[PDB]
């Protein structure tokens, strides 16, 4: 509309209405110029055997993008508590996005002193990739999302993508994308932008823990009418072979017939937080579970959803089977264990095999008068008819959705880092500053213009999500476990700022507190 | 409308709908001040015999102009592929042009440091020459067109024209044009400009190759009922004259009667890309085919459409009979052969004579008992009744249309560099910055003001063309030749940017892949 009028307002809050909760977040952003308005080809710079798994080919673009795909973007710690203590499940419904109060600044630097002024006629370009025609980078747990704390101003991350590569070289099948070749809306300082999005139907995330285990579903007072083989020999001696059968009952619950079995496993190596218990060797990469694709090895991370550890042992964690978050101010490389937060999937032990254990045993031969029965350990087990399992939990710091790859087939497309898998997830929102050239020469030149005015933009983003709730119906008599704050005195309030104004998140918070019968 | 509102959006894409394809391109431009707001008379500065062919007289203007007349302005490489593999022909239908988001910048340079600021009250003037009253420069294969890659910012070329000249002097018949003497629209930063244009009916470009040759149209199993003269003598000796006649048939297809003959020729000198095969002398200009007009010699370039070379010989090319494009970053003068891309017209061999060959032989005398039959080579042949020919192909880098000169007569007005000839082509679009004078003296002076504020403008151009398609109907059993990318690994993707952000076009791409029966 105009230079002196505001194109939007600040909306941050949650509205709890019945079975719906509506969250709204507003943040202030800053967008630089990336790559000097250039598309640039990029590839791994390394050589040798080590480079092999790390090889890539792709492009970086002048564009930035908006990422709201973490939960702490949309929920305060109190709202997340209010969610996870009272509800058995939740899921996103609608999405509403706004971009407003756009300001374009020009920077003239002379003799080491820089001046910043408004450029009132400059534009910023924005479009959403509604047709999912661009490579989709939002499901890779990247940085650059809206900050959890509403008072922080954040920088918009640069967009880039990878295409097919052989080592660091490309192939004829590799694709190049100009983002200028999409239609986009152009905004001066009075203009604003919005769009709305509709989540496709997904299952409720299961924010509850089971109060029964898959192997304990029987009535503890009654026998089965099934029999099992109790004895193959009468005793010590020669030629003692016999067949004896017993009823499965309360005394022996391990041999009873069951209708359902625990879910699939891919074994992880077990690491202790007590370092003297670990082996004195480097086994981080060498001893890691991995999968290979076209010759390259990828770590299995986090992998299939499995219980992090056995009951009573919390000092162990899967080598690359858990999500690990950094504490506030944690460095990038080779930080100690107290600098990171290792989450655990202990709640899913009821239906899921432990990550660091074998699935079970199988017979490896035929026993005979000349051959003893032999067994072997099942290190990995794929889906069997009759398996039941839980997905990975979601966290306040963790991702919300992922894009399901477009393929002939998939199974249980729920994404492995947690959250909601979608064939049409929330679309990517691309933004860049329109280049403003400096003064051209006075005689014509056919070369493209490499001289521009140094420029950046800033503004406000609001995002609104409607969430559907699934309320707890339980008949449990005794009280539940709840997520709660601790009363003990401390130098800081958790989930607040410190004396320097730095907001931190003390610990990762999962979703599973309330219980359900298995 | 306003300073803080945007006057247009960014539209780039193609829409393939049935028999129509609609392309839309948006670019960012920069317009300087040319000639210090002056019209200036210009003429060749050279003297001597060499100057004769190069003599000219004309004017340069303060105005710039917009040129979208190359195909890579409107088509991406993938769209051009999608066009040429699937279609027998195409042609333009409608045109829509927009000019928006205008910014005028003033440059104040003090002590070697220059400041750039917005001048919000300045205007830019624009008009289209709808009545074709200006000299038309768009059909001369000039530089300054919108860049093929949408992310590049381009400088607008300066407008100028030539009028009648005798050497470097003018004549009374020479015309002068003030472009200020047209009505034009004036635009401040909130204003925008548009117009729409309707292509006049042109034939479809023939984007196909013939799967038959003009001389092979007979049924290979059957004789003709026509006779030809097989023998004029019985054998060796004296007085052996006779007349013998044979049937033309499968055994001798060269002597058969035919209804149609190949098209016209003007012979070109043949040059090899293997330099040891070429003569050790300078023959580029001296050995070139030319035409003379009013005493001046013009190279025949590219000339009539003729097959570039005989089958099996691709190392030869016509001396000035082909279009030659430069590779990205190629210098202006005396570049090597690997720096340029020589296109070929090998597809049209079926109906057209080879450029470097004679058309044929004619009888030069009357044979008699005292005189042997004599023949001579036809170096150039004009139109004959019964000729058929193909036009020159169009390229992704090549021109789209030309203006047919306004004359009493023309023949097959299709332009010789390729594309669509039109009596009313897309009009010229002229643009200049309105001069803003600096402070005048405080006492009156009648001289025109020579002191101005240094100023330039920038903005966005979008152009939209609707193209009509002619779909391939063929009954051919075996598969076609298609244009395709090569799978082999390379350091760069073709038709992409490199690591420095430079977009290049690897090779020229013609239109002729699908085949038709002759």
């Amino acid at each position: 509309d105009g230079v002196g009028s505001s194109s939007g307002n600040w909306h941050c809050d949650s509205q709890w209405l019945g079975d719906r909760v509506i969250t709204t977040s507003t943040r202030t952003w800053a967008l630089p110029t990336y790559n000097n308005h250039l598309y640039k080809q990029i590839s791994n710079s390394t050589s040798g055997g080590s480079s092999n798994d790390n090889a890539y080919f792709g492009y970086s673009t002048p564009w930035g993008y908006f990422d709201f795909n973490r939960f702490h973007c949309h929920f305060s710690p109190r709202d997340w508590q209010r969610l996870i203590n009272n509800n058995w499940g939740f899921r996103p419904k609608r999405l509403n996005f706004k971009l407003f109060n756009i300001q374009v600044k020009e920077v003239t630097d002379n003799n080491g002193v820089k001046t910043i002024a408004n450029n009132l006629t400059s534009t910023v370009q924005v479009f959403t990739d509604s047709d999912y025609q661009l490579p989709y980078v939002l499901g890779s747990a990247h940085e650059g999302c809206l900050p959890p704390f509403p008072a922080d101003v954040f920088m918009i991350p640069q967009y880039g993508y990878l295409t097919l590569n052989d080592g660091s070289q490309a192939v004829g099948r590799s694709s190049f994308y100009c983002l200028e070749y999409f239609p986009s809306q152009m905004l001066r300082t009075g203009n604003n932008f919005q769009f709305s999005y509709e989540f496709e139907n997904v299952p409720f995330h299961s924010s509850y823990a089971h109060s029964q285990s898959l192997d304990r579903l029987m009535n503890p007072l009654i026998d089965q009418y099934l029999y099992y083989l109790s004895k193959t020999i009468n005793g010590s001696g020669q030629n003692q072979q016999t067949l004896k059968f017993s009823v499965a009952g309360p005394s022996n619950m391990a041999v009873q017939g069951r209708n359902y079995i625990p879910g699939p496993s891919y074994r992880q190596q077990r690491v202790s937080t007590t370092v003297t218990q670990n082996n004195n060797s480097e086994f981080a990469w060498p001893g890691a579970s991995s999968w290979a694709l076209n010759g390259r090895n990828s770590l299995m991370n986090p992998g299939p959803a499995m219980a992090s550890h056995k009951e009573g042992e919390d000092r162990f964690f899967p080598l690359s089977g858990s999500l690990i978050f950094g504490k506030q101010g944690t460095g990038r490389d080779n930080v100690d264990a107290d600098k990171v937060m290792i989450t655990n999937e202990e709640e899913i032990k009821t239906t899921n095999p432990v990550a660091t254990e074998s699935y079970g045993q199988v017979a490896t031969n035929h026993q005979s008068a000349q051959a003893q029965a032999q067994t072997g350990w099942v290190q990995n087990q794929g889906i069997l008819p009759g398996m039941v399992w839980q997905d990975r939990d979601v966290y306040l710091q963790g991702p919300i959705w992922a894009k399901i790859p477009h393929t002939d087939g998939n199974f249980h497309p729920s994404p492995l880092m947690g959250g909601f898998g979608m064939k049409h997830p929330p679309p990517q929102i691309l933004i860049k500053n329109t280049p403003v050239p400096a003064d051209p020469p006075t005689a014509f030149n056919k070369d493209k213009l490499n001289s521009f005015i140094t420029q950046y933009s800033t503004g406000q983003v609001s995002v609104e999500i409607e969430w559907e709730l699934q309320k707890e119906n339980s008949k449990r008599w005794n009280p539940e476990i709840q997520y709660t704050s601790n009363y003990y005195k401390s130098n800081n309030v958790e989930f607040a700022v410190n004396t320097e104004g730095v907001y931190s998140e003390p610990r990762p918070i999962g979703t599973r507190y309330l219980t359900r019968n298995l | 409308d306003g300073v803080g509102s945007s006057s247009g959006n960014w539209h780039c894409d193609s829409q393939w709908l049935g028999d129509r394809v609609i392309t839309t391109s948006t670019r960012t431009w920069a317009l300087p001040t040319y000639n210090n707001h002056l019209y200036k008379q210009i003429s060749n500065s050279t003297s001597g015999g060499s100057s004769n062919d190069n003599a000219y007289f004309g004017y340069s203007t303060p105005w710039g102009y917009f040129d979208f007349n190359r195909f890579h302005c409107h088509f991406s490489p993938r769209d051009w592929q999608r066009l040429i593999n699937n279609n027998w022909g195409f042609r333009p239908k409608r045109l829509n042009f927009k000019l928006f988001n205008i910014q005028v910048k003033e440059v104040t340079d003090n002590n070697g440091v220059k400041t750039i600021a917005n001048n919000l009250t300045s205007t830019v003037q624009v008009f289209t020459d709808s009545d074709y009253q200006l000299p038309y420069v768009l059909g001369s294969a000039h530089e300054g067109c919108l860049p093929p890659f949408p992310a590049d910012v381009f400088m607008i070329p300066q407008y100028g024209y030539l009028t009648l000249n005798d050497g470097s002097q003018a004549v009374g018949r020479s015309s002068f044009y003030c472009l200020e003497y047209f009505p034009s629209q004036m635009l401040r930063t909130g204003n925008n400009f548009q117009f729409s244009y309707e292509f006049e009916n042109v034939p479809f470009h023939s984007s196909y190759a013939h799967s038959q040759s003009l001389d092979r149209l007979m049924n290979p199993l059957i004789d003709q009922y026509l006779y030809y003269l097989s023998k004029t003598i019985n054998g060796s000796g004296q007085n052996q004259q006779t007349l013998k006649f044979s049937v033309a048939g499968p055994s001798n297809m060269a002597v058969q009667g035919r209804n149609y003959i190949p098209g016209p020729s003007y012979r070109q000198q043949r040059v090899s890309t293997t330099v040891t095969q070429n003569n050790n002398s300078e023959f580029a200009w001296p050995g070139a085919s030319s035409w003379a007009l009013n005493g001046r010699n013009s190279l025949m370039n590219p000339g009539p459409a003729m097959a570039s070379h005989k089958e099996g010989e691709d190392r030869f090319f016509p001396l000035s009979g082909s279009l030659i494009f430069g590779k990205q970053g190629t210098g202006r003068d005396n570049v090597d052969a690997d720096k340029v891309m020589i296109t070929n017209e090998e597809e049209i061999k079926t109906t057209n004579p080879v450029a470097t060959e004679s058309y044929g032989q004619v009888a030069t005398n009357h044979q008699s008992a005292q005189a042997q039959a004599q023949t001579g080579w036809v170096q150039n042949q004009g139109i004959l009744p019964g000729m058929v020919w193909q036009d020159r192909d169009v390229y992704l880098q090549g021109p789209i249309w030309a203006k047919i000169p306004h004359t009493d007569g023309n023949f097959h007005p299709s332009p010789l560099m390729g594309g669509f000839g039109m009596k009313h082509p897309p009009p010229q679009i002229l643009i200049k910055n309105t001069p803003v004078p600096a402070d005048p003296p405080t006492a009156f002076n009648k001289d025109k003001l020579n002191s101005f504020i240094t100023q330039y403008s920038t903005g966005q151009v979008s152009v939209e063309i609707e193209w009509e398609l002619q779909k391939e109907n063929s009954k051919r059993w075996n598969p076609e030749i298609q244009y395709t990318s090569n799978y082999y690994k390379s350091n760069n993707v073709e038709f992409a940017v490199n690591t420095e952000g430079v977009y290049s076009e690897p090779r020229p791409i013609g239109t002729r892949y699908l085949t038709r029966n002759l």
Epitope: S45, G48, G49, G167, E282 | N491, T499
Partner: antibody, heavy 119, light 107 residues
Framework: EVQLVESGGGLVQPGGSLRLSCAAS????????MSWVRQAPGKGPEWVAN????????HYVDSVKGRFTISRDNAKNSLYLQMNSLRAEDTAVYYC????????????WGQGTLVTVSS | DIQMTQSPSSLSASVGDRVTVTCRAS??????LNWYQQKPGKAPKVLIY???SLQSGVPSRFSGSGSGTDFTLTISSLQPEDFATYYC?????????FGQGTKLEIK
């Protein structure tokens, strides 16, 4: 089939600068990483530098960092090693090698040129 | 960087004998280990690359085994042509490093 030729070897006083050129006729030169390997007299060979198949990146051994520049011309299929501030230790036979695709070993080696740094 | 240690530094055997050379790596270099045979006045020639795999055109008597930090070069049915200096090189990371070398002697 695949041939690598090294030229420019010779004797130079310390602090001197020398340039070495490698010619490759047998393969697609732009698909491969190329290395420089030196073997001092009576010693095992030693890796000096490698450069990317397009020349975007390059690596050098610590001892020679800043004094040597590896360079690649893909159109001429030639590899160049630029040596500055030469030392007595530097004198060795210089080998031009091609790094194998995927495996990364030196599948092909040039004959090599002896380069002497003498007082 | 990574250090490569080759043992024994020198070895002497006779035609028909079985010879084994051991290479050790300071850090994990996976399967990227090569064995080069070198004769005076010539460049090193690759015998075995990527741990186990044998170079084409090389006799089947040369064999290689091992992964991670320990590798071994095995020669069965030794031949007069086999006497040379042998190097183990790691191509896992830069700077690429070579072993000290094992020299074989006629007996």
């Amino acid at each position: 089939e695949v041939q690598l030729v090294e030229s420019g070897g010779g004797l130079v006083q310390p602090g001197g600068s020398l340039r070495l050129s490698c010619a490759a006729s047998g393969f697609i030169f732009s698909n491969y990483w190329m290395s420089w390997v030196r073997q001092a007299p009576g010693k095992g060979p030693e890796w000096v530098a490698n450069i990317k198949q397009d020349g975007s990146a390059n690596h050098y051994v610590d001892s020679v960092k800043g004094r040597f520049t590896i360079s690649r011309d893909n159109a001429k299929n030639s590899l160049y090693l630029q040596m500055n501030s030469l030392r007595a230790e530097d004198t060795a036979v210089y080998y031009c090698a091609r790094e194998a695709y995927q495996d990364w070993n030196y599948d092909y080696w040039g004959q090599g040129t002896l380069v002497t740094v003498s007082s | 960087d990574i250090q490569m240690t080759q043992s024994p530094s020198s070895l002497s055997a006779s035609v028909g004998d079985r010879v084994t050379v051991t290479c050790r790596a300071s850090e994990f270099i996976s399967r990227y280990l090569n064995w080069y045979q070198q004769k005076p006045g010539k460049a090193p020639k690759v015998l075995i690359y990527a741990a186990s795999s044998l170079q084409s055109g090389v006799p089947s008597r040369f064999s290689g085994s091992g992964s991670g930090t320990d590798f071994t070069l095995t020669i069965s049915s030794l031949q007069p042509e086999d006497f040379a200096t042998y190097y183990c090189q790691q191509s896992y990371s830069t700077p690429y490093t070579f072993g000290q070398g094992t020299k074989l002697e006629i007996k």
